[PDB]
């Protein structure tokens, strides 16, 4: 017969102002700042805060099969997280699209 209601003032509970619009205005470094940001929040309490990065990544980067790069990486490669930085750098070049930054 438990749990006494209470309150908070952080904003929404755990969240970060960060996301953008397109790799183009992201330096590798902010991509690193972004993705590793799953290393933290994900393992956290809730998955209504993860779907935020999850679906920006999936959006801006396009191919090969979004999340799959984040999640089921590749056996002989980089497993967490500078290989999704790597292997992504490929796609956009063979399929037209511009790249990272300064």
């Amino acid at each position: 017969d438990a749990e006494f209601r209470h309150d908070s003032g952080y904003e929404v509970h755990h969240q970060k102002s960060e996301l953008k619009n397109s790799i183009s205005d992201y330096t590798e470094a902010e991509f690193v700042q972004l993705l590793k940001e799953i290393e933290k929040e994900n393992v956290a309490a809730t998955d209504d805060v993860l779907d935020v990065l999850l679906e920006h990544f999936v959006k801006i980067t396009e191919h090969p099969d979004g999340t799959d790069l984040i999640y089921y990486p590749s056996d002989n490669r980089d497993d967490s997280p500078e290989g999704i930085v790597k292997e992504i750098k490929e796609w956009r070049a063979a399929n037209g699209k511009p790249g990272f930054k300064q």
Partner: antibody
Amino acid sequence: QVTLKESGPGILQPSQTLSLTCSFSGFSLRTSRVGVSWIRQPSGKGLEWLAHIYWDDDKRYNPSLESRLTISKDTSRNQVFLKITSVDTADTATYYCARRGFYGRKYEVNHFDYWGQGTTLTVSS
Amino acid sequence: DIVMTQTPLSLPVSLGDQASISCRSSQTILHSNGNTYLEWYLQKPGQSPNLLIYKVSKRFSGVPDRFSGSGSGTDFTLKISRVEAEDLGVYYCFQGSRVPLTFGAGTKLELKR
């Protein structure tokens, strides 16, 4: 200036119904945000907790009671209430209303800064 | 109901003598939002309580740097390193994470002779 004032009959009689009124000064119950708890202490014993309201008429009762207890307020009047049904000899007690305050904006820092004096009820026929 | 436990239930001493009490919550009081809503109350003779310390260890308005109190999870302690008269009274620990919100039973710090 904040001060808390309980009030009642002070001398009831068995299986009936009480009403406790708790009353504020110096500040206001609308954008105060604080909550209000009823805690009673029996003549020559400890302390026990009866109920609680929140800045938005939210009401949370001790299960080891609940059915008897009834808590409420008015912001216009600027006071919090408490009915206990079929009052029994067991209710014989000094009753305390209590503000559940905090450190401003840091809402989750909730304690009981300020407790009133106490309104004493004897329930004997 | 839920139970909080005090040790001692009566601690008598003379003035300027260091004092210290302890409360253990039958099962952890660490509230889902993360914090440990435990308080340390006091009933000076013939008048109300009287908060002192909230959230394990943050000391409330105007209560001297002397009335410390640390702890964690279930164990928690209070200390007066200078018992004075404004200190002698009943001391109740308390919880605030689960309904109901239960005080200890009450230690009666007091004058020794």
